[PDB]
Design a protein around this ligand. Structure first.
Ligand SMILES: [Hg+2]
Ligand SMILES: [Mn+2]
Ligand SMILES: [Mn+2]
Length: 219
């Protein structure tokens, strides 16, 4: 897989970005239906964390097989992948809601295992160019003051770090050069937040049912 992945927005009509799903498949589908999403024209970008804690995990993970669904891996996808790895330890994954995997029927377990393999092909960062506007999507954060396509980075920081949102909430706010807007999930909040040119759209759908989707193009 490649850390960065570029998406040419001019190839789609409307483009949306959704926060952490954690098995909230039905919630998502109803939203798309409600916003008039057309999978033959529009594009949905995901911040990752498609599985764990929630109920419809396989259904959510499977979305990565659809052309209209473009996701970046979250720390939960990583824990699942490492956990299922030949020399991996499931401990961490089970301590984060991965139990659903060991509760699947035989058929689904096989499907889940194949989908986990595909999840390991997911990028860590997505660069979306839309109308001369550049949007960067990562699960938790882009650990640099300046963004640069292809710049090597520690994946752990991209998917686990909460230091930036933490300072932003403590008053310490700073912009990230290199792109117009940054969109992350990972850290839940009652309402979508925005500090400088950074947006946080994880409104804890698995916890309360509030799943947020922001439109970044069209309409
Ligand atoms: Hg919530
Ligand atoms: Mn999450
Ligand atoms: Mn997360």
């Amino acid at each position: 897989m490649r850390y960065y992945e570029k998406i040419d927005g001019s190839k789609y009509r409307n483009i949306w970005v959704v926060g952490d799903l954690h098995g909230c498949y039905t919630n998502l589908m109803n939203k798309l239906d409600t916003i008039g999403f057309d999978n033959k024209k529009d594009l949905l970008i995901s911040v990752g964390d498609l599985v764990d804690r929630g109920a419809e995990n396989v259904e959510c993970l499977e979305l990565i097989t659809f052309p209209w669904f473009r996701a970046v891996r979250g720390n939960h996808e990583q824990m699942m992948i490492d956990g299922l790895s030949e020399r991996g330890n499931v401990n961490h994954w089970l301590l984060n809601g991965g139990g659903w995997f060991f509760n699947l029927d035989y058929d689904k377990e096989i499907l889940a295992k194949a989908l986990a393999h595909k999840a390991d092909e997911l990028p860590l960062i997505i660069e979306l160019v839309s109308k001369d506007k550049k949007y960067v999507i990562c699960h938790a954060d882009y650990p640099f003051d300046e963004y640069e396509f292809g710049k090597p980075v520690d994946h752990q920081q991209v998917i686990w770090n909460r230091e930036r949102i933490s300072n932003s909430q403590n008053g310490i706010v700073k912009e990230i050069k290199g792109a117009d807007t940054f969109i992350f999930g990972h850290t839940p909040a009652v309402k979508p937040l925005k500090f400088a040119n950074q947006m946080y759209i994880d409104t804890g759908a698995v916890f309360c049912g509030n799943l947020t989707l922001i439109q970044v193009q069209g309409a």
